[PDB]
Scaffold this motif. Structure first.
Motif, PDB file in Angstrom:
ATOM      1  N   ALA A  20       0.824  -1.202   0.000  1.00 56.52           N
ATOM      2  CA  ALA A  20       0.000   0.000   0.000  1.00 56.52           C
ATOM      3  C   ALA A  20       0.862   1.257   0.000  1.00 56.52           C
ATOM      4  O   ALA A  20       0.410   2.331   0.395  1.00 56.52           O
ATOM      5  CB  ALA A  20      -0.936  -0.001   1.200  1.00 56.52           C
ATOM      6  N   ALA A  21       2.106   1.120  -0.454  1.00 64.78           N
ATOM      7  CA  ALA A  21       3.022   2.250  -0.513  1.00 64.78           C
ATOM      8  C   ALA A  21       3.087   2.812  -1.926  1.00 64.78           C
ATOM      9  O   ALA A  21       2.834   3.997  -2.146  1.00 64.78           O
ATOM     10  CB  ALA A  21       4.409   1.833  -0.041  1.00 64.78           C
ATOM     11  N   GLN A  22       3.415   1.952  -2.884  1.00 64.13           N
ATOM     12  CA  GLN A  22       3.499   2.362  -4.280  1.00 64.13           C
ATOM     13  C   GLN A  22       2.150   2.882  -4.772  1.00 64.13           C
ATOM     14  O   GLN A  22       2.077   3.618  -5.755  1.00 64.13           O
ATOM     15  CB  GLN A  22       3.960   1.191  -5.151  1.00 64.13           C
ATOM     16  N   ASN A  23       1.085   2.496  -4.075  1.00 64.54           N
ATOM     17  CA  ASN A  23      -0.260   2.923  -4.430  1.00 64.54           C
ATOM     18  C   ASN A  23      -0.453   4.398  -4.112  1.00 64.54           C
ATOM     19  O   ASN A  23      -0.743   5.206  -4.995  1.00 64.54           O
ATOM     20  CB  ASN A  23      -1.287   2.090  -3.666  1.00 64.54           C
ATOM     21  N   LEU A  24      -0.290   4.741  -2.840  1.00 65.46           N
ATOM     22  CA  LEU A  24      -0.446   6.124  -2.395  1.00 65.46           C
ATOM     23  C   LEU A  24       0.697   6.988  -2.913  1.00 65.46           C
ATOM     24  O   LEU A  24       0.503   8.155  -3.252  1.00 65.46           O
ATOM     25  CB  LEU A  24      -0.500   6.197  -0.867  1.00 65.46           C
ATOM     26  N   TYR A  25       1.890   6.406  -2.973  1.00 61.55           N
ATOM     27  CA  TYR A  25       3.068   7.124  -3.450  1.00 61.55           C
ATOM     28  C   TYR A  25       2.857   7.651  -4.866  1.00 61.55           C
ATOM     29  O   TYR A  25       3.529   8.588  -5.298  1.00 61.55           O
ATOM     30  CB  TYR A  25       4.300   6.219  -3.411  1.00 61.55           C
ATOM     31  N   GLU A  26       1.920   7.045  -5.583  1.00 59.01           N
ATOM     32  CA  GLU A  26       1.618   7.453  -6.950  1.00 59.01           C
ATOM     33  C   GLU A  26       0.982   8.839  -6.971  1.00 59.01           C
ATOM     34  O   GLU A  26       1.183   9.610  -7.910  1.00 59.01           O
ATOM     35  CB  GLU A  26       0.684   6.439  -7.615  1.00 59.01           C
ATOM     36  N   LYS A  27       0.214   9.149  -5.932  1.00 55.18           N
ATOM     37  CA  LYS A  27      -0.451  10.443  -5.832  1.00 55.18           C
ATOM     38  C   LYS A  27       0.393  11.438  -5.037  1.00 55.18           C
ATOM     39  O   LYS A  27      -0.101  12.481  -4.612  1.00 55.18           O
ATOM     40  CB  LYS A  27      -1.824  10.284  -5.175  1.00 55.18           C
ATOM     41  N   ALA A  32      -2.106  14.506   2.187  1.00 58.13           N
ATOM     42  CA  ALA A  32      -1.514  15.219   3.317  1.00 58.13           C
ATOM     43  C   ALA A  32      -0.019  15.457   3.133  1.00 58.13           C
ATOM     44  O   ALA A  32       0.712  15.614   4.109  1.00 58.13           O
ATOM     45  CB  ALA A  32      -1.768  14.456   4.608  1.00 58.13           C
ATOM     46  N   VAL A  33       0.435  15.504   1.886  1.00 60.45           N
ATOM     47  CA  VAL A  33       1.845  15.747   1.612  1.00 60.45           C
ATOM     48  C   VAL A  33       2.169  17.218   1.814  1.00 60.45           C
ATOM     49  O   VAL A  33       3.241  17.571   2.306  1.00 60.45           O
ATOM     50  CB  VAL A  33       2.237  15.329   0.184  1.00 60.45           C
ATOM     51  N   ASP A  34       1.222  18.073   1.446  1.00 63.72           N
ATOM     52  CA  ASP A  34       1.390  19.509   1.600  1.00 63.72           C
ATOM     53  C   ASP A  34       1.307  19.898   3.073  1.00 63.72           C
ATOM     54  O   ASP A  34       1.758  20.975   3.465  1.00 63.72           O
ATOM     55  CB  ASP A  34       0.325  20.259   0.799  1.00 63.72           C
ATOM     56  N   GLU A  35       0.729  19.015   3.885  1.00 68.66           N
ATOM     57  CA  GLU A  35       0.592  19.271   5.314  1.00 68.66           C
ATOM     58  C   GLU A  35       1.348  18.231   6.139  1.00 68.66           C
ATOM     59  O   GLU A  35       1.111  18.092   7.339  1.00 68.66           O
ATOM     60  CB  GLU A  35      -0.886  19.274   5.710  1.00 68.66           C
TER      61      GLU A  35
END
Length: 67
Positions: A20-27, A32-35
């Motif tokens: 479930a890393a490469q999945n979210l890492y795609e976006k 919550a990357v900006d935060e």
């Protein structure tokens, strides 16, 4: 020996974190990357990692040089 058994369990949750890393890492962890991946780090260790550019360099070296 006895650790090998747990290794099957302690690893049964380590293989998922990657599933479930490469999945979210795609976006780009947009949710919550900006935060978090920019505000909750403050280049604390972001520039030190840069794995984003080594994700393939760290493995590409494995082919020869174990680097």
């Amino acid at each position: 020996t006895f650790l090998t058994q747990v290794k099957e369990s302690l690893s049964s949750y380590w293989e998922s974190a990657k599933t479930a890393a490469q999945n979210l890492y795609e976006k780009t962890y947009l949710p919550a990357v900006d935060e978090k991946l920019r505000d909750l780090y403050s280049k604390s260790t972001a520039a030190m990692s840069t794995y984003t550019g080594i994700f393939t360099d760290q493995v590409l070296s494995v082919l020869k040089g174990e680097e």
